[PDB]
């Protein structure tokens, strides 16, 4: 699908909803794409946090690069980002040495997620 720039000049990632319920499968399978050449089999990891939650609990935050593409099978956010607050994502490509790309205000995780007014 449509990619997007990360805080690193070497990596791009898929688009994530701005708001999503915790532990809920994402609408679009997340994936990290390397601009430059990255060896197949190279591991890629995802982490999250901010001023309210220093480290969000995630699920399946590990993927192996393949043809420049590392797609996470069912990544989920369990830790919550806080009212109005968003998560800073830290993408880590394990090359030697490790390359790390961040993505600020990436996604807001809450108990309910988006909901129609009441």
């Amino acid at each position: 699908g449509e990619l997007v720039r990360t805080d690193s000049p070497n990596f791009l990632c898929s688009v994530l909803p701005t708001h999503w319920r915790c532990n809920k499968t994402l609408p679009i399978a997340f994936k990290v794409v390397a601009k430059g050449d990255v060896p197949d089999g190279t591991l890629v990891t995802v982490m999250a946090g901010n001023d309210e939650n220093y480290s969000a609990e995630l699920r399946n935050a590990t993927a192996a690069m393949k043809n420049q593409v590392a797609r996470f099978n069912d990544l989920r956010f369990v830790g919550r980002s806080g009212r109005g607050k968003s998560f800073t994502l830290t993408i880590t490509v394990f090359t030697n040495p490790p390359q790390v790309a961040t993505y600020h205000r990436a996604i807001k995780i809450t108990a309910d997620g988006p909901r129609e007014p009441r």
Binding site: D7, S8, P9, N10, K35, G36, T45, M47, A48, G49, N50, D51, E52, N53, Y54, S55, E57, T88, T90, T92, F94, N96, P97, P98, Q99, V100, A101, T102
Partner: protein, 130 residues
């Protein structure tokens, strides 16, 4: 490109790096859902292997650290102070060669740390990119 041209500038200019150039509060992000006992052993035994997960509490910026150059002794120090550890790991953060540096209380599992531009790897890196 694995790095940005203004490699040296970006570190001194950009706010992201500036806020992490001073002695910020760091913390072990591993297995937050497990007993403190288990987190303790896990964290130390993992350092011996040369790896750990730490984030700058204040900013909430997480980082996966690899204690090695471009088992160790200079990158992971358990002697420099009883009950403490002085880790150190380089990397290319957002297209900028840097070196993570800090310490953690083997019992509290937290401490202080910060980033430091890496003149060395930075240069040579730009060399490849030409």
């Amino acid at each position: 490109p694995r790095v940005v041209p203004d490699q040296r500038s970006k570190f001194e200019n950009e706010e992201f790096f500036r806020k992490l150039s001073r002695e910020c509060e760091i913390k072990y992000t591993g297995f937050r859902d497990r007993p403190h006992e288990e987190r303790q052993t896990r964290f130390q035994n993992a350092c011996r292997d040369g790896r750990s997960e730490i984030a700058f509490v204040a900013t909430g910026t997480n980082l996966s650290l690899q204690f090695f150059p471009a088992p160790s002794r200079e990158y992971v120090d358990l002697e420099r102070e009883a009950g403490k550890v002085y880790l150190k790991a380089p990397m290319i953060l957002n297209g900028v060669c840097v070196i993570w540096k800090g310490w953690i209380d083997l019992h509290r599992l937290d401490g202080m740390g910060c980033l430091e531009f890496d003149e060395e790897r930075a240069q040579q890196e730009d060399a490849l990119a030409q």
